[PDB]
Design a protein around this nucleic acid. Structure first.
Ligand SMILES: [C]O[C]1[C]([O])[C]([C]OP([O])(=O)[O-]P(=O)([O-])OP(=O)([O-])O[C][C]2O[C](N3[C]=[N+]([C])C4=C3N=C([N])[N]C4=O)[C]([O])[C]2[O])O[C]1N1[C]=NC2=C1N=[C]N=C2[N]
Ligand SMILES: O=c1ccn([C@@H]2O[C@H](COP(=O)(O)OP(=O)(O)OP(=O)(O)O)[C@@H](O)[C@H]2O)c(=O)[nH]1
Ligand SMILES: [Mg+2]
Ligand SMILES: [Mg+2]
Lengths: 1140, 96, 498, 185
RNA sequence: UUACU
């Protein structure tokens, strides 16, 4: 009844203090309580603080509730509910009853969003305030019904739990359930008990299966009694009764995996938890002191001002950490020595973002063009290029307050992070470069996520497969808060003690000079010789201001009480990595110091996610597992608490028993909140294809997820709205209505542009250049249908084969023709979609933005940028890029260096807008592109394709099944890899994952910005190989177009020589390692599966090209694979084309 | 005052850096043309690039000035941890 | 030089360094100032940064790179006819001399040459700039000290007005020494502060104040309590702490010294609070001042409230730094306590005992001790375990936001409407930052006080005062901006009011 | 190298710690020559080192290409040594001569033969105390002074340009002033 | 209106 008739406003729900300075501290219901739309209203006049409160709470209910990824809010909810009709063939599924009962008012929807006026405007004022989130919850549960994670009757238990959370505060109730409702599997894995699992080898192939009995040990059975009492009262009793059946009924290790992913989607809707950030400043970034204070170092040296210069620890928590870390200061001082930092400054001051500043009065006195550029980091350094060597540059930015950026995640609460300007970014940079070189030194300073596939988990898959191990995986809780200034100092000694042994001259606005230094236990100042790294680090360490200051529309300027970690500085990933590495490894020196063993194996720290691995008896490991907790407990950290036998998590990826569990709900399909790089474009479908491939091994039914991505691809992503002008509006309508319907829109006073939106037909959802989405089986002429395209289908030039696949490829080889059926492509509408491809709207909108800005104003700005750096002979990289192109062939833009000085400026002209005068000459150029290509169209076929038209013929004799398939027969090595499914059989028939390929690719991206999926496109690596394979004697010349160092040159060359077995540059295909986790990279593994009669081997690369033909058609047609071995026949022009 | 070597080196270091005798450039020619990429030399190019280190201007001027400086603190070698296992390990002997 | 001494001559006059009247170095100092008019133009031409500073810095510093399409290399070509114009056998050289007033006044185009020069650095003793170095000694006016021993003639010590200037160290009047002793035509350096060499418990301690010898009393050999109030407002004790000056210490000698310059890195942090007090945007700005227990700041920032409120036209009030400890002892027991502002300030300083001085007092007993000389007999790790025991009664008031906790006290005092717009809290120990609320401006006060000497002073100090200074120094490192109490009195004045 | 007497210091009556002040300049001034007699010494070293790595490769039967790409690297150090020995033996050697005549560079450093040299250990003896040696391993680093980096010869040989290797740009070889290293001394 | 790895 809190949803069917909600209460009134109750203004004690968002109270204030005695003053109107901030909200009342310790207030509950910090998020948007469900109160029934009508009741908020302004009463009183535009001042008197509380008016700005009710106006901004209106911004919470009307603006911060919608975040629709592709379409509007209603088109997206219809996309599940239509797809959920088509798949289950009926309408007796009970999700639509929640669509009917939660909102139905008989004339029109209860609420819509404006887009142009940007708010959700209501049409029933009596409906609940919280309902625009319940679109996305009904969206997500139907995504989970379609995924196969939840059945229909389970989604009843889901939806009742969500509406029960909505009685008082829909997210505040959810964040308390979030901890309890997924910690329960460790009981169910205990109860299952003896469970038969695969095991892995050192080099991650499956070598065996064993039955290893999961009974978690005696001391975590004492954590079951404390936790199940909290399960009973904090949860809804039907959601509780669903859990208590999953403890008792579960019989296999596969069976707990069924309930766990399904109970996880009952606690999440994927909605990003958005309120106004004044409410979450108290919750997220307020510093907590968990119990202990951390004491200070003995300061050994101090300069003329009494501040820390050199310092050492005395019997604390830090002395444990510097027992491990201070050994590295003699080596890192030769790696932090041998970079020249001014160079590495301009490469880290890439990624254009903000400076804090709004430039100011001097935005006028730099120019009106560079006024509008003035957001990027690379531009705000260019405007103040003159000030870079003066030491008063950093002094005038201590005066500048740090502004609170907010960004939110899928399940964490609304979180804030500090957007530092260029000078507060400068002091943190030398602690970033010092703490970076511990990564190459110590494995356990660990994994960056360049693999995407199994190598990000190939560590965790191995140690869980082993015997006599307990695994702990620690999050500290909140690790921005906890880092008081004293705990921050343990990283400061390590950054100092490297910089003394090192020799860095000048660094920036410093120089190695002769300072007065107090030497503790001397009386009297004695002048040491300090280098610039030393000076910079001391100043930054001394000076540190931590507070974030957010300007409010309610309040004046709220400022966080400092002492947190301002997590944007430069070292926000190293300061929590180098610290926790010193505390846990330093423990096994201190435990070895007083007669106890260590008994700890490899530990992987990506800050803050600690994950260590132990071995021995069940008593020895626990004596160590307490001290890793207790020293982190006495470091001032709130470790939450996690450990188990056979359970381990890292980077939000669960590994258990030697199997991979998914966390499917974290990829929310239909909530973005980015306000940056929004596509309703070709690029909007790439944002679907990348997220559809995120969920292919987190799903129990990938065929159903292809059904869901199709209709949301169809219904939502269908309409591209374009503002023409009137005279051209007439013929823009007439030309495009010839092929596919274009909507027309009602005419305009006194803006002189009519809108009009084209309708982008369903074939464009399948095109090679448009939507690269895998298809359903079409009809040929007779018609015996095509193969159903599965989830493992690779993208780029392969979707152009689907055009030839409709034309009966087997038939074509019969008549010896490259000819094509224009009838069948025009009938479905394939011909009307490749026109929309050839119109090329996207770079045309980029061309007009590239047309408007004067390159003279850019060049004066960018010549001043290369004054800070190298100094000279960034010119030799521009010379190397231009010498390569005119002698040979085009090496394109983003990659080579000084163009990627110029390209880093460009993005603010890309940012700062489409607006209308530029938009009127969009339509003048596009209509010229329209009337040329509409004047006649036929499907343009290229000489560069013969090179499909090959078709496989099934035979009567079966394959072998690769003996690791018996081991992963049981139990449930991933979610979709259940026994007798498509992904299991592909891991059986296609088989394997090599270590040899994606170690070198894991070696490539350590050059070039690693922390995520890194899917194989990599415009250094493909462009360098097309020169390496066919062409290279030139390959000396474009390495200095990279400005690749001699070490960096060595990485790439070893990957080029290994990428010469497979495959072809001439036939393009792209998949992602997120798409095929355990499936093989190599087309070598598929040549075992297809014989080629060896009169077809007809060119020097032609063995290596036929492998990709064998590689893809197994992955494309895996739902129609009996386990027969197919055989290849070819068109003789395909024989004729590769001869050359 | 055994820090007196720190002065006499620093006077001699300030002479070498003021003479403009060695200027470090940003072009590396450790290997001839198209032996870098040549597969058989993959064992050799790793040994050279591990030893060779970026030419900081501050310590090339120090090594010249240490040659005629008075030695008061007894110098000692950086602990070179090599194996002399492969025949690509002659790079350490050519270094000496 | 970095700044030329003929177009900008008064800055060298502020250091005691007067320009020699108008030869191979008189001709060279005109040659260097001609480059600055060329250099400054060039970094106009393209704002600011003169382009290719490497070939620039290999011309002034090194007699090198004669150069003759073009406009790129135009400013190089115009300059190679300018430095090969005057015949030098080597370069000109730089001369930063290591001073936050001098280093801040270096123009932008000189600082871009510092990366590629190896410049000559002249180490300041305390300031003055101290006069060796064929640059500083052949260019202008090696001076002559004029203490009480070298009296009273210029013919006696063989001085000349074109080579040597005179530093008044008599204690006599300035005007007579160039009247009857014959020092007319001899120009005199002007110093407006003074340097005091005190006696100490540990040795000779040299501190300076930026007051002249007339502006305060104390000469020669008066004690430390005479005009103590002016020394706290304006002094730096340039010595490694523990310096060890005491209330029984006297003066050895006085010489006029250069007025020291405040801290461009520590002027601007304090300038945030002196902006947030002015603007009507920021509700209830807060200044947080950390120091040791014996820095003597409750007697100091009681009049800095009196200097800010008279300049701002507002009402400020400092919370007097122990008002958690005085107040929690009074109402440990009381279920609803009064969080009012007028109740807090009518409670402390001094007669109400602190709560931590109850807790510390009980604790010292348990490891039984009551004498300060008995505390010296204890040593470090046996001491430090006592400090660790002392912490656990700290964290019980810092961890949660209970109704008697520290977080609730500094909140409701700061919010509730009876309080002043802009309170100044002061904290003893670091990691009170999660409790004081809410600010962007936390400074760190280092006064002219060996604080552990003032705790054996205190004169009802005992071990309870001295154990807690030691406990708080274990919790307070210098991880914030040191603020040096004359600099807060300096920044009020600089700020531009309405 | 050779052994140059300090004729400019003794005529200037500078303090020296020897009877004959003799510093060891590392290599001879080599004007007017076509073949550089310091560069051709490094020819006969690589020609000796080519046969040492030849025996080690053929005793342990490695590739024909790995032995060729080793010896193609040994004569790439030949080419780079010829290009810079014109600038060492003309412009570095006149700096080691004039740094030897400075005031505070008073000890001898080297005397030709590695087989016999030890630095002359003076001490400050005392009949009523211990003797304090001058040269003494006490590990008192001056922040990088006692540790000696042998990887400094790779930037010297390869990635540095010299004011005589560049001849073809106009350079005007820098002769520094006497007064800075005199006034500090 | 918008941070780093
Ligand atoms: C130039 O032009 C342009 C474009 O086109 C636009 C867009 O629009 P759209 O968005 O497309 O729409 P949509 O979304 O499609 O829609 P739907 O969803 O389909 O449905 C609808 C709805 O809607 C609404 N509406 C609402 N509101 C609010 C509105 C509307 N319409 C209109 N027209 N307007 C508005 O406002 C309803 O209701 C319904 O329901 O846009 C454009 N743009 C715009 N603006 C701008 C742009 N650009 C740039 N700039 C600017 N300013
Ligand atoms: O955008 C981001 C996201 C995350 N981080 C990372 O967040 C870390 C600090 O965040 P924590 O990981 O410590 O938060 P918490 O887990 O204690 O919060 P709860 O789950 O308990 O609710 C930092 O160490 C950092 O590396 C960022 O710096 N930026
Ligand atoms: Mg965490
Ligand atoms: Mg985390």
């Amino acid at each position: 009844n809190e949803i069917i008739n909600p209460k009134e406003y109750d203004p004690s729900d968002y109270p204030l203090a005695e003053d109107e300075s901030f909200f009342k501290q310790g207030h509950k219901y910090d998020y948007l309580v469900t109160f029934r739309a009508g009741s908020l209203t302004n009463t009183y006049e535009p001042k008197t603080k509380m008016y700005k409160l009710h106006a901004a709470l209106d911004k919470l209910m009307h603006v911060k509730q919608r975040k629709s990824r592709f379409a509007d809010l209603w088109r997206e909810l219809c996309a599940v509910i239509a797809s959920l009709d088509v798949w289950y063939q009926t309408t007796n599924y009970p999700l639509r009853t929640y669509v009917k009962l939660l909102f139905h008012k008989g004339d029109e929807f209860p609420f819509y969003e404006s887009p142009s006026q940007d708010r959700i405007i209501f049409n029933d004022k009596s409906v609940a305030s919280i309902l625009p989130t319940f679109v996305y919850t009904c969206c997500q549960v139907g995504t989970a019904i379609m995924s196969g994670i939840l059945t229909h009757v389970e989604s009843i238990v889901a939806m009742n739990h969500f509406l029960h959370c909505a009685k008082d505060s829909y997210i505040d109730e959810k964040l308390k359930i979030k901890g309890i409702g997924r910690s329960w599997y460790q009981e169910a894995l205990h109860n299952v008990c003896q469970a038969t699992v695969p095991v892995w080898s050192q080099f991650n192939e499956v070598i065996g299966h064993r039955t290893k009995s999961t009974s978690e040990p005696h001391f975590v059975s004492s954590t079951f009694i404390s936790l199940r009492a909290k399960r009973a009262e904090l949860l809804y009793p039907e959601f509780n009764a669903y859990i208590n059946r999953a403890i008792q009924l579960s019989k296999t290790q596969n069976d707990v995996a069924n309930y766990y992913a399904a109970c996880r989607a009952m606690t999440n809707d994927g909605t990003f938890l958005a309120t106004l950030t004044e409410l979450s400043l108290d919750a997220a970034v307020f510093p907590r002191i968990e119990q202990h204070l951390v004491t200070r170092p003995a300061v050994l040296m101090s300069n003329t001002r009494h501040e820390s210069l050199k310092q050492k620890y005395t019997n604390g928590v830090g002395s444990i950490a510097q027992s491990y870390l201070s050994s590295f200061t003699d080596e890192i001082a030769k790696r932090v020595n041998g970079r020249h930092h001014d160079e590495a400054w301009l490469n880290f001051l890439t990624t254009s973002s903000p400076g804090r500043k709004l430039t100011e009065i001097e935005k006028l006195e730099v120019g009106g063009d560079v006024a509008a550029w003035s957001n990027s980091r690379i531009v705000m350094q260019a405007v103040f290029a003159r000030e870079y060597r003066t030491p008063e540059r950093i002094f005038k930015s201590l005066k500048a307050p740090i502004k609170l950026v907010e960004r939110q995640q899928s399940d964490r609460r609304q979180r804030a992070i500090s957007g530092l300007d260029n000078d507060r970014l400068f002091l943190s940079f030398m602690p970033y470069t010092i703490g970076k070189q511990i990564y190459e030194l110590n494995d356990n300073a660990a994994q960056g996520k360049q693999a995407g596939n199994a190598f990000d988990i190939g560590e965790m898959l191995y140690w869980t497969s082993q015997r006599n191990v307990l695994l702990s995986s620690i999050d500290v809780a909140g690790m921005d808060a906890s880092v008081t200034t004293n705990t921050k100092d343990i990283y400061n000694t390590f950054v100092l003690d490297v910089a003394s042994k090192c020799t860095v001259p000048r660094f920036g606005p410093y120089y190695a000079k002769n300072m007065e230094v107090f030497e503790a236990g001397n009386r009297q100042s004695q002048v040491r010789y300090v280098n610039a790294a030393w000076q910079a680090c001391a100043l930054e360490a001394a000076n540190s201001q931590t507070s974030t200051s957010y300007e409010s529309e309610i309040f004046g300027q709220v400022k966080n009480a400092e002492g947190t970690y301002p997590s944007g500085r430069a070292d926000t990933s190293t300061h929590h990595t180098v610290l926790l590495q010193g505390l846990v490894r330093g423990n096994e020196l201190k435990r070895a110091s007083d007669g106890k063993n260590s008994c700890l194996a490899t530990i992987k720290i990506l800050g803050d996610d600690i994950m260590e691995i132990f071995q021995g008896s069940e008593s020895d490991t626990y004596d160590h597992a307490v001290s890793n907790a207790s020293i982190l407990n006495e470091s001032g950290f709130a470790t939450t608490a996690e450990l188990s036998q056979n359970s381990i998590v890292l980077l939000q990826q669960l590994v258990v028993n030697g199997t991979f569990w998914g966390f499917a709900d974290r990829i929310s399909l239909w909530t973005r909140e980015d306000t940056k790089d929004i596509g309703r474009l070709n690029l909007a479908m790439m944002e679907l294809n990348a997220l559809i491939d995120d969920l292919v091994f987190r799903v129990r039914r990938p065929e159903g997820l292809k059904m869901l991505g199709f209709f949301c691809g169809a219904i939502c992503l269908r309409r591209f709205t374009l503002s023409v002008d009137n005279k051209l509006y007439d013929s823009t309508y007439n030309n495009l209505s010839k092929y596919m319907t274009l909507t027309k829109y009602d005419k305009n006073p006194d803006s002189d542009s009519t809108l009009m939106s084209l309708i982008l037909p369903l074939a464009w959802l399948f095109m090679p250049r448009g939507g690269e989405y895998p298809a359903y089986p079409f009809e040929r002429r007779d018609g015996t249908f095509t193969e159903d395209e599965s989830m493992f289908t690779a993208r780029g030039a392969y979707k152009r084969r689907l055009l030839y696949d409709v034309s009966n490829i087997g038939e074509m080889i019969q008549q010896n023709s490259m000819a094509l059926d224009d009838d069948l492509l025009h009938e479905y509408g394939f011909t009307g979609a490749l026109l929309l491809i050839d119109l090329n709207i996207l770079d045309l909108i980029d061309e007009v933005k590239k047309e408007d800005i004067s390159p003279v104003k850019v060049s004066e700005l960018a010549t001043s940028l290369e004054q800070l750096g190298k100094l000279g002979e960034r010119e030799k990289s521009r010379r190397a890029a231009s010498d390569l192109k005119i002698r040979g062939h085009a090496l394109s833009n983003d990659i080579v260096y000084g163009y990627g000085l110029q390209e880093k400026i460009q993005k603010s002209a890309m940012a700062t807008k489409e607006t209308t005068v530029q938009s009127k000459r969009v339509s003048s150029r596009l209509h010229d592109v329209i009337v040329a290509k509409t004047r006649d169209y036929k499907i343009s076929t290229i000489p560069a394709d013969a090179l499909h038209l090959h078709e496989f013929e099934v035979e009567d004799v079966t394959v072998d099944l690769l003996p690791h398939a018996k081991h992963t027969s049981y139990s449930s090595l991933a979610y979709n890899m259940s026994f007798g499914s498509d992904g299991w059989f592909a891991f059986a028939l296609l088989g394997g994952l090599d270590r040899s390929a994606n170690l070198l690719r894991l070696d490539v991206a350590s050059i070039r910005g690693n922390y995520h999926k890194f899917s194989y496109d990599d415009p250094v690596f493909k462009q360098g190989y097309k020169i390496y394979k066919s062409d290279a004697t030139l390959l000396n010349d474009f390495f200095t177009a990279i400005s690749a160092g001699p070490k960096e040159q060595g990485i790439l060359l070893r990957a080029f020589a290994y990428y010469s077995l497979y495959g072809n540059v001439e036939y393009h295909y792209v998949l992602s390692p997120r798409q095929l986790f355990f499936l093989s990279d190599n087309p070598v593994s598929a040549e075992r599966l297809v014989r080629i009669p060896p009169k077809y081997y007809v060119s020097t690369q032609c063995r290596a090209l036929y492998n990709i033909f064998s590689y893809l058609h197994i992955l494309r047609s895996i739902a129609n694979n009996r386990g027969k071995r197919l055989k290849m026949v070819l068109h003789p022009g395909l024989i004729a084309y590769v001869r050359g | 005052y055994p820090r007196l070597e720190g002065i006499i080196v620093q006077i001699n270091t300030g002479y070498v850096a003021s003479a403009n005798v060695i200027r470090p450039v940003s072009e590396k020619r450790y290997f001839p043309e198209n032996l870098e990429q040549n597969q058989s030399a993959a064992r050799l190019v790793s040994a050279v690039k591990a030893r060779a280190s970026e030419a900081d201007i501050s310590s090339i001027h120090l090594a010249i000035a240490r040659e005629v400086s008075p030695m008061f603190n007894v110098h000692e070698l950086k602990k070179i941890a090599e194996s002399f296992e492969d025949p690509s390990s002659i790079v350490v002997v050519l270094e000496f | 030089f970095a700044i030329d001494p003929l177009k900008h001559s008064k800055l060298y006059e502020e250091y005691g360094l007067y320009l020699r009247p108008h030869a191979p170095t008189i001709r060279s100092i005109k040659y260097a100032s001609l480059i600055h008019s060329m250099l400054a133009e060039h970094a106009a031409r393209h704002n600011g940064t003169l382009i290719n500073p490497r070939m620039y810095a290999d011309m002034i510093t090194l007699g090198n790179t004669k150069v003759t399409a073009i406009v790129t290399y135009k400013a190089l070509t115009e300059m190679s006819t300018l430095i090969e114009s005057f015949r030098l056998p080597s370069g000109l050289t730089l001369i930063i001399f290591d001073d936050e007033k001098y280093q801040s006044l270096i123009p932008n185009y000189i600082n871009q040459l510092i990366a590629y020069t190896q410049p000559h650095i002249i180490p300041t003793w305390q300031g003055i700039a101290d006069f060796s170095d064929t640059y500083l000694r052949s260019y202008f006016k090696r001076p002559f000290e004029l203490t009480a021993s070298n009296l009273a003639a210029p013919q006696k010590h063989n001085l000349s007005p074109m080579t040597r200037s005179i530093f008044n160290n008599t204690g006599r009047e300035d005007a007579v020494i160039r009247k009857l002793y014959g020092y007319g035509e001899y120009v005199f350096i002007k110093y407006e502060g003074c340097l005091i060499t005190w006696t100490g418990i540990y040795g000779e301690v040299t501190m300076m104040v930026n007051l002249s010898k007339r502006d305060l009393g104390l000469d020669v050999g008066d004690d430390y309590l005479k005009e103590y109030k002016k020394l706290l407002f304006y002094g730096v004790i340039t010595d490694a702490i523990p310096s060890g000056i005491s209330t029984r210490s006297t003066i050895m000698k006085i010489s006029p010294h250069k007025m020291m310059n405040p801290s461009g890195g520590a002027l601007a942090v304090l300038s945030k609070f002196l902006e947030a007090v002015v603007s009507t945007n920021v509700i209830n700005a807060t200044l947080v001042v950390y120091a040791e227990k014996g820095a003597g700041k409750t007697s100091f920032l009681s009049t800095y409230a009196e200097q800010l409120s008279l300049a701002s036209g507002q009402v400020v009030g400092h919370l007097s730094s122990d008002a958690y400890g005085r107040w929690l002892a009074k109402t440990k027991d009381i279920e609803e306590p009064s969080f009012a502002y007028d109740y807090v300030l009518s409670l402390d300083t001094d007669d109400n005992e602190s709560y931590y001085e109850q807790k510390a007092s009980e604790l010292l007993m348990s490891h039984g001790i009551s004498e300060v000389a008995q505390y010296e007999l204890l040593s470090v790790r046996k001491k430090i375990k006592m400090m660790d025991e002392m912490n656990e009664v700290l964290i019980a008031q810092l961890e949660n936001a209970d109704t008697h906790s520290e977080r609730n006290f500094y909140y409701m005092v700061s919010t509730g409407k009876t309080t002043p717009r802009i309170l100044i809290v002061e904290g003893h120990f670091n990691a009170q930052d999660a409790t004081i609320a809410r600010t962007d401006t936390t400074v760190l006060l280092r006064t002219i006080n060996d604080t552990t000497q003032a705790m054996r002073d205190r004169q009802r100090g005992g071990v309870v005062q001295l154990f807690l200074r030691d406990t708080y120094y274990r919790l307070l490192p210098a991880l914030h901006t040191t603020v040096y109490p004359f600099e807060m009195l300096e920044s009020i004045k600089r700020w531009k009011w309405v | 190298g050779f052994l140059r007497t300090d004729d400019l210091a003794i005529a200037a009556n500078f303090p020296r710690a020897s009877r004959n002040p003799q510093t060891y300049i590392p290599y001879t001034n080599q004007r007017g020559t076509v073949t550089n007699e310091f560069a051709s010494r490094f020819r006969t070293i690589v020609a000796t080192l080519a046969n040492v790595v030849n025996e080690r490769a053929v005793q342990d039967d490695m590739q024909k290409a790995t032995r060729s790409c080793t010896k193609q690297w040994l004569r790439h150090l030949e080419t780079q040594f010829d290009n810079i020995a014109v600038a060492h033996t003309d412009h570095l050697s006149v700096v080691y001569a004039t740094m030897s005549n400075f005031m505070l560079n008073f000890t001898n450093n080297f005397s030709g033969n590695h087989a016999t040299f030890k630095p002359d250990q003076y001490v400050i003896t005392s009949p009523e105390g211990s003797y304090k040696p001058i040269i003494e391993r006490q590990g008192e680093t001056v922040d990088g002074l006692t540790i000696i980096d042998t990887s400094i010869v790779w930037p010297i040989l390869c990635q540095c340009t010299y004011p005589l290797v560049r001849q073809s740009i106009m350079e005007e070889i820098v002769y520094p002033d006497p007064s800075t290293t005199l006034s500090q001394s």
